[PDB]
Amino acid sequence: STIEEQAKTFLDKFNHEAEDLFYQSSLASWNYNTNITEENVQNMNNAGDKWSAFLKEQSTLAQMYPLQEIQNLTVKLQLQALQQNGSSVLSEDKSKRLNTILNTMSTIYSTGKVCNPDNPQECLLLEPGLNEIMANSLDYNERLWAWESWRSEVGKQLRPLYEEYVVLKNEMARANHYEDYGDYWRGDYEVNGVDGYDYSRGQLIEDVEHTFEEIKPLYEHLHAYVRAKLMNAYPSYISPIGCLPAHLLGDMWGRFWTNLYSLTVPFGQKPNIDVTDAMVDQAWDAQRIFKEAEKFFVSVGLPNMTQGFWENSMLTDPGNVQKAVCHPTAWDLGKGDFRILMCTKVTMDDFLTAHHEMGHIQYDMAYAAQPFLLRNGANEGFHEAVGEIMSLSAATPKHLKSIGLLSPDFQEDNETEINFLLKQALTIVGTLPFTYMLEKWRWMVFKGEIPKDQWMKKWWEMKREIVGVVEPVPHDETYCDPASLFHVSNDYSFIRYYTRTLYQFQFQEALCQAAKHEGPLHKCDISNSTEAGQKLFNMLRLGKSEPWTLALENVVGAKNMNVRPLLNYFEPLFTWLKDQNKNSFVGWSTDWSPYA
Amino acid sequence: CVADYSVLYNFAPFFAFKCYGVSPTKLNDLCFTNVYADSFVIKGNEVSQIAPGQTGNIADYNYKLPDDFTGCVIAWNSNKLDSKHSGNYDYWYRLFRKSKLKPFERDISTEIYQAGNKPCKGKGPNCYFPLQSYGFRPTYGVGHQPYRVVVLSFELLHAPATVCGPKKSTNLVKNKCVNFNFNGLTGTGVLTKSNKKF
Ligand SMILES: *[C@@H]1O[C@H](CO)[C@@H](O[C@@H]2O[C@H](CO)[C@@H](O[C@@H]3O[C@H](CO[C@H]4O[C@H](CO)[C@@H](O)[C@H](O)[C@@H]4O)[C@@H](O)[C@H](O[C@H]4O[C@H](CO)[C@@H](O)[C@H](O)[C@@H]4O)[C@@H]3O)[C@H](O)[C@H]2NC(C)=O)[C@H](O)[C@H]1NC(C)=O
Ligand SMILES: *[C@@H]1O[C@H](CO)[C@@H](O[C@@H]2O[C@H](CO)[C@@H](O[C@@H]3O[C@H](CO)[C@@H](O)[C@H](O)[C@@H]3O)[C@H](O)[C@H]2NC(C)=O)[C@H](O)[C@H]1NC(C)=O
Ligand SMILES: *[C@@H]1O[C@H](CO)[C@@H](O[C@@H]2O[C@H](CO)[C@@H](O)[C@H](O)[C@H]2NC(C)=O)[C@H](O)[C@H]1NC(C)=O
Ligand SMILES: *[C@@H]1O[C@H](CO)[C@@H](O[C@@H]2O[C@H](CO)[C@@H](O)[C@H](O)[C@H]2NC(C)=O)[C@H](O)[C@H]1NC(C)=O
Ligand SMILES: *[C@@H]1O[C@H](CO)[C@@H](O)[C@H](O)[C@H]1NC(C)=O
Ligand SMILES: *[C@@H]1O[C@H](CO)[C@@H](O)[C@H](O)[C@H]1NC(C)=O
User: Fold this and answer.
1) N or C: more exposed end of chain B, with fewer CB within 10 A?
2) With an 8 Å Cβ cutoff, are B140 and A337 in contact?
3) B142/A336 touch (CB, cutoff 8 Å), yes or no
4) Is A30 strand, coil or helix?
5) What are the start-end ranges of the E strands in B8-145?
6) Pairing relationship of beta strands A469-470 and A244-245 according to DSSP bridges
7) Which ligand sits closest to the CA of A322?
8) Which residues of B touch A24 (CB under 8 A)?
9) Looking at A205-319, which runs of residues are DSSP E strands?
10) How far apart (Å, rounded) are the C-alpha atoms in residues A18 and B131?
């Protein structure tokens, strides 16, 4: 009779079909993941094709019922999802060109190679050595040559491809209900239907600027230290207060400075809290680590993994023709099948990664009872935060004493916590400038403010300003540094992390506050807590029936984003940065150029 | 006939074997008019949906029962026997029925999922087919596996029962004062050997 009755009759079969065909496609992909053969590739591709094509038959009837007479708002959100992620506007030619550009971008980026200097005999890719030459090798000439050659050999080819891709995406968004593809990315966090929790699209620019400025004095304080330590090993290359060259970052994209831990160590004589050496002595292995990771959820109160998961998940790389890719994946297939495909070594870092991966599986299992069309977190970043908070909490010396590998005789002092604080800040604080600047440049390039010939120039205008890092060799419009980046060259929104980092700190402080836990914020374990676990489980099973603002106000009683937990976490480290950098200049010199 | 109720206790422990309208201790010594043997397959989450009175969203869809269902319904897993890694799409069930059903009534008569502006009927949008394939796998967790279930109704009504539990016996002692019972012949005395010609 009414719109809702017909819509729910239509959705009754489609919910089961979305379970079934998506499970079939994900199972084909997972069988291929556990067994890399050509026929598994074909099965994965065909299953994905049939699933995504069947999505069209139901999205066609989804648009058949418009969205202006819906009162449950379950039908409204589910029809919006159907009309967005199963519908399109581009004609066959424009969509075909878009997909061809994506395929060519991926092909060039993955198959691109850089050869050894002054020789075409031996050539290397990006993954084997380039991620490790920057990380390990420190020679000026070799790193400069590799950086220049690789950046040229990717950006020069891919820059016109990106210029075509951005125009096609802008046209598609204009034909859509968006101003531009930049706004299309800006609409991911959008909220509608519930007053007092609706999110305005124009606030995304305004919110980010609010807290970042207040944290700008911290980062330059960190920049006051790094340039001090780097000049210890690179005296002549670096200016005392000037901008840093863009080929010694330790990584291709200047994401982190943590890998410079030895270079940027505060105190290099106190041994690290290490249990990997003690792991062998106590006959530890992968199963022991994963079982204690399960015991973590057992003690907090979250439901633990079923034996069906432990039976089928591949913990170790089979090798031989049974080759796979052990990248951390928290597979979400449903129907009770949630499995983890990641190869684990006997280390504390792999222990952290195992917690990180198991957290997302925990969340997915918790909200699996929800309808498949609403089996999603509050937004993109909440699912990441669910595992990230547990991964962070797995870095506590007291719970590591409770492990037993680290003897209880271990002591807490300046140099067993400050050394970790600096590493954590280099992981978290150091990535903020590039993290915001990438989104800023993508917004600028998609919006159309910059003339085409100035597109690269702006890219190098803010590199000296936001991050304080200057190029070692100028790159013109032919080069495209973001074309060497994972997300930009493959059209992936980078805004998820700049919000997940904000949400995880609030989640962690809520867990540490509701559990009545004392001490510095870097000492907080929730294993022996129930209020924190219960208040997390409240959000675990909710699903998509709430926005991100309301769900965030269900954590600390605050709808919107905040930075206070992040500042509090490094507050002793903030005092350290303020105290130890008294005679070092605060800031950076943009006009300085090391390239003569 | 003679129905013993220790036969299932010999068998594997059936998970949701429960009794509602009968006496568990008197099961082997109670008389019932007849026995009904409705046997079917349910998935784990909606096994309890086939409930007396508390008709679940599956019971009104597939098979319902009166409020005071007297007897016991036995439910147990049939995963390994009845699950395939390719999906038990051969095992179907009307997941999309429209209203309440009636006790002792198969859903073989298809109740077309018709709800909307379309008098379409049959199969399709707003006229869907109620039948849904289970698609079972032996790898599924709890709630998505073929729990095979049977309804053993212990009806006892106006018609004579003639369906009761067995009765055991003891030894025979002769030349000793004793009480006795011979198919309902109470009395006490001394039992010896006789030379009569019945
Ligand atoms: C609308 O429809 C689109 C389909 O176009 C959906 O978009 C997909 O969303 C999923 C979910 O995020 C994306 O999957 C993600 O892929 C990332 C990249 O992984 C690749 O690279 C690694 C190597 O680094 C390989 O091992 C891997 O096999 C892939 O080749 C993953 O990193 C992501 O995992 C992250 O989350 C898990 C927890 O779930 C963590 O444990 C991980 O550590 C990691 O942080 C993720 O799996 C997929 O790429 C998207 N497709 C496209 C084309 O963009 C939308 O989700 C959908 N909208 C809905 C359903 O609302
Ligand atoms: C708006 O949409 C939601 C989601 O589709 C509807 O939620 C559904 O609500 C009904 C009754 O309110 C639930 O049925 C209940 O099932 C339980 C368990 O079987 C039973 O104990 C109850 O007696 C009742 O029958 C149904 O499960 C639930 N669906 C989901 C997916 O949660 C809601 O009803 C809609 N609003 C209106 C006014 O219809
Ligand atoms: C991975 O997949 C391949 C092919 O998809 C499997 O190889 C087949 O295995 C079956 C089962 O023993 C044999 O009957 C076939 O002859 C094999 N064919 C080939 C071409 O090898 C392989 O067994 C799978 N791996 C695992 C661990 O099952
Ligand atoms: C949570 O509680 C458990 C058990 O109450 C703690 O485990 C004890 O840890 C201490 C020191 O690590 C040992 O001396 C005991 O033998 C442990 N007991 C058991 C039963 O394992 C655990 O340490 C607590 N969590 C934290 C973070 O301290
Ligand atoms: C962990 O899983 C096992 C299954 O083997 C279960 O018996 C146990 O109760 C689970 N722990 C908790 C705390 O639920
Ligand atoms: C080390 O910790 C002690 C705590 O007793 C403190 O007084 C001292 O200032 C700390 N050292 C530095 C360099 O902060």
Assistant:
1) C
2) yes
3) yes
4) helix
5) 18-19, 36-43, 71-77, 92-94, 113-114, 127-128, 131-133
6) parallel
7) 3
8) 87
9) 244-245
10) 16
